[PDB]
């Protein structure tokens, strides 16, 4: 309304404001010192009060963004330093706006951060509060100017959740570094995902991200109608559409009024948004976004009568298309929340596509009339994968499973970097014990979650780059775990003679490397000298000596060079 | 068993106006989007509009666009239809529609429907 600053700080509170404009700013002027945001910042804060004190005083009528870009351009330093970004200032909005966009540096090629030591840290902490957090704020955005500023300042809230309790504590380290650890990690997935997200939606197309919306948001909420399922599509596409084209203000307009909807219509959605839509307002798009499946309605008729049996089905296809479609893959979503969401596209591609071919013939009715056993193998095919290496995890551990898989790898792409091998694999193993404690209705959405994360990792991996996999990689999203899990031995390395995990990781690494340099012998062989080094190292740590590992070493070397050849 | 029943019809000038309503029952009104649809003498069936099931959530076939308010009072039961800006093609019957549901589907050329009323004449010349 007027003062819509003032309408904003009312909202988010003066310290979330103070935070998501600090981290704003950060975005864009990359290269000014952490003294001169805050100066900003606190321009930007104190003018923001006068608005909520009087929102009839000088400029509080403004929008945010003149107000946003007005503060931008009255930065001394910014033809100097980000040269043209201040030839923007020249233009009116909304062209300034955009003409800031473009001068965003996704890889601001400055010094890359090193982890104090936790003493000093927590030090760091306990003297100064506000300024060390903001400090770290301050220089994650600046390297991170693509990431939804609210979602910075919820992993913000974390890290200070960690300080305070795990800095008054015996060892520091043990309690910090754990978790400081995890968040980084979350939040370069969650990187991972946004930037995913939006490749495939200007890769692929609106259409196919609606699809799969569709199939998500029906799982999500199943006792929603068709036709509010699909309006939430809608609204969702544009959010996507916004953000990823950079804007922080407009994205955050567009998912608060999301957000705002979905709770006005709660009752007709899920009745599992209580609490989300009861959330302040920035927690309150997070959550809903991350709230559970719904109940599915109870007693829900045949999806077959709708689209095997009744008549007009290719009247209704060739009049609503993609409605139809979004329908059939809505109706079948809602009805299957055990399944992976891209085998609910993998069935609706192929129900389409029998729609295609049927619709087209002499008697259409005949043709289609068993289209639902198509779907019998492709959703066998994943469940039995699940099933398969669920009991090999189970059998054998998560440690020795990754050894596991770190064969079977190897074994079918030797090309790749061992590094890359071990990480890969060791992480596939992680997945396992992530998904096979779920029950078994569970895993198969568990591990599309956590496969799309470990595939996504490697095919960014494969930017500095084994022409194999690329094909995998610049597939459909749909059918890339199906082309990856469709690797057969490549068939076609010198010897060089040359701790808890880190140990554990060099083991693996010495794995990878005895399947490299010798891809063809096979695993009885394998777990002969898994077996002798697994003897080596313990008889050798166990020795006073540092000359045990070297004698035994070149006896465990060439033990088994004989064994191989 | 969903029930809809439209009233309000009749003969108007030429940039008059009618407002429609239509009473529900049989289903839990308040909780599922409502639609109007018309067909004109020897044409298809048109969608002219649609609500969301709290209201305040309107859209409107382009032709309608600026004469025509939906609306509900989840009150009452009632869905209305505030025809303003009348016109000759404009003539046709207005049926109000939902997909309550577990029935067979229909195409109302933007959403599909299980259940109509009988309709409501609207006539609109001279």
């Known amino acids: 309304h007027k003062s819509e600053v003032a309408h904003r700080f009312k909202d988010l509170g003066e310290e979330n404001f103070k935070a998501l404009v600090l981290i704003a700013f950060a975005q864009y002027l990359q290269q000014c010192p952490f003294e001169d945001h805050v100066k900003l910042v606190n321009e930007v804060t104190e003018f923001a009060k006068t608005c909520v004190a009087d929102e009839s005083a000088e400029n509080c009528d403004k929008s945010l963004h003149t107000l946003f870009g007005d503060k931008l351009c009255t930065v001394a330093t910014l033809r100097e330093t980000y040269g043209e970004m201040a030839d923007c200032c020249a233009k009116q909005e909304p062209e300034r706006n955009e003409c800031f966009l473009q001068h965003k540096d996704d890889n601001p090629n400055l010094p890359r951060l090193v982890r104090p030591e936790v003493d000093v840290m927590c030090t760091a902490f306990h003297d100064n509060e506000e300024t060390f957090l903001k400090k770290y704020l301050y220089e994650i955005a600046r390297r991170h100017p693509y990431f939804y500023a609210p979602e910075l300042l919820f992993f913000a809230k974390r890290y200070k959740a960690a300080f305070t309790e795990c800095c008054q504590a015996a060892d520091k380290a043990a309690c910090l570094l754990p978790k400081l650890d995890e968040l980084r990690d979350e939040g370069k997935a969650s990187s991972a995902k946004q930037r995913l997200k939006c490749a495939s939606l200007q890769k692929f197309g609106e259409r196919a991200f609606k699809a799969w919306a569709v199939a998500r948001l029906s799982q999500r909420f199943p006792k929603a109608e068709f036709a509010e399922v699909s309006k939430l599509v809608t609204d969702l596409t544009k959010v996507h559409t916004e953000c990823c084209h950079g804007d922080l203000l407009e994205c955050a307009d567009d998912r608060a009024d999301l957000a705002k909807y979905i709770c006005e219509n709660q009752d007709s959605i899920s009745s599992k948004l209580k609490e989300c839509c009861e959330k302040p307002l920035l927690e309150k798009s997070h959550c809903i976004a991350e709230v559970e499946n719904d109940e599915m309605p109870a007693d829900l008729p045949s999806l077959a009568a709708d689209f095997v049996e009744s008549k007009d089905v290719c009247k209704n296809y060739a009049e609503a298309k993609d409605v139809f479609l979004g329908m059939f893959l809505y109706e079948y979503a809602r009805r299957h929340p055990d399944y992976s969401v891209v085998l609910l596209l993998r069935l609706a591609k192929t129900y389409e596509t029998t729609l295609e071919k049927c619709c087209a013939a002499a008697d259409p009715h005949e043709c289609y009339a068993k289209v639902f056993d198509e779907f019998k193998p492709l959703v066998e095919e994943p469940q039995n994968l699940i099933k398969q290496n669920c009991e090999l995890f189970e059998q054998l551990g998560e440690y020795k499973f990754q050894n596991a898989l770190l064969v079977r790898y190897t074994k079918k792409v030797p090309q790749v970097s061992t590094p890359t091998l071990v990480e890969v694999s060791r992480n596939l193993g992680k997945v396992g014990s992530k998904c096979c404690k779920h029950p078994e209705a569970k895993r198969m959405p568990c591990a599309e979650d956590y496969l799309s994360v470990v595939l996504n990792q490697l095919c960014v991996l494969h930017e500095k780059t084994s022409d194999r996999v690329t094909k995998c990689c610049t597939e459909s999203l749909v059918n890339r775990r199906p082309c990856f899990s469709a690797l057969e031995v490549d068939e076609t390395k010198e010897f060089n003679a040359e701790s808890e995990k880190e140990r554990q990781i060099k083991k693996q690494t010495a794995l990878v490397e005895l399947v490299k340099h010798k891809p063809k012998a096979t695993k009885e062989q394998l777990k002969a000298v898994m077996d002798d080094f697994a003897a080596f190292v313990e008889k050798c740590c166990k020795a006073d000596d540092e000359t045990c590992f070297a004698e035994e070493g070149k006896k465990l070397v060439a033990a088994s060079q004989a064994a191989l050849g | 068993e969903v029930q809809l029943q439209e009233s309000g019809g009749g003969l108007v000038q030429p940039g008059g106006s009618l407002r429609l309503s239509c009473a529900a029952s049989?289903?839990?009104?308040?909780?599922?989007?409502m639609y109007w649809v018309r067909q004109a003498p020897g044409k298809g069936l048109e969608w002219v509009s649609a609500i969301n099931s709290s209201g305040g959530y309107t859209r409107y076939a382009d032709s309608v666009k600026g004469r025509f308010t939906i609306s509900r009072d989840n009150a009452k039961n009632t869905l209305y239809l505030q025809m303003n800006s009348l016109r000759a093609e404009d003539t046709a019957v207005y049926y109000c529609?939902?997909?309550?549901?577990?029935?067979?589907?229909?195409?109302?050329?933007?959403?599909?429907?299980?259940?109509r009323g009988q309709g409501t004449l609207v006539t609109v010349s001279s």
């Open positions: 529609a939902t997909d309550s549901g577990d029935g067979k589907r229909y195409w109302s050329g933007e959403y599909f429907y299980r259940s």
């Open positions: 049989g289903f839990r009104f308040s909780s599922y989007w």
